[PDB]
């Protein structure tokens, strides 16, 4: 019944200096999970139940950078398990979509592309879906 | 020479339901530290060197809440070791100030008051200053 809201946090300075997004990103969600990508790809996940609505938004640690989610691609999108769409006002946009598991329960990989002050960088988070 | 930029992340829904800010806040900074207050007061800290400039800003996980830093009080302010001031445009404000340790090095406690959609709630982070 409750939405799962996900905040991606980017260390933008470091992302741009290295061109490595994964090592410079964190996830915090309303499940009270927090993952650092610096500690591994395995940490960049969200837990959710079939039928739940998911909401993503992205922010930078520094006030001087601007960051947006440009696009989602990959497995979760290919198989139509969750197709987020862009919403909100210019300024704080966010992306939302419902999880349509096939009453299966599984892992769904996806590719999120972010624009970090106009630099497009991709990373590979995943969903863990239970029934 | 580099600024230390600090992002406070609030689970606003949960903060307001409990009236407990500490258990529902995270810190991530450009030192690549991440602390959850849910795991204890001891985690809500920032490392810095004497003479360094510190920058704080606050965001909510959800796009539906608005959150601001209202005020800093307590030890760090009393002793004039770091007096942040408010800056930026309406929308993304932030607070900044330089650390003037007495070439001592120490812990400085402070009280940050945040407005969570108009609800004023306080918590007790701290600085760890080295020379």
Numbering used by the authors:
A (entry chain A), B (entry chain A): 1 to 131
Excerpt from the publication:
While the cholera toxin is the primary virulence factor, V. cholerae also expresses other virulence factors, such as the tripartite toxin MakABE that is secreted via the bacterial flagellum. MakABE are co-expressed with two accessory proteins, MakD and MakC, which are encoded by the same makDCBAE operon, although their functions remain unknown. The structures are very similar with a root mean square deviation (RMSD) of 0.45 Å calculated on 126 Cα-atoms.
To determine the crystal structure of MakC, a construct encoding the full length MakC, with an N-terminal cleavable histidine tag, was designed and expressed in E. coli. Consequently, SeMet labeled MakC was prepared, yielding needle-like crystals. The crystals, which belonged to space group C2221 and contained one molecule in the asymmetric unit, diffracted to 2.0 Å. In MakD, two dimers were present in the asymmetric unit, whereas the MakC dimer is formed by crystallographic symmetry. In MakC, the residue in the equivalent position is a valine, and there are no other cysteines in MakC that could potentially form disulfide bonds in the dimer-dimer interface. The equivalent β-sheet of MakC is less hydrophobic based on the electrostatic potential map, and the polar residues are more evenly distributed.
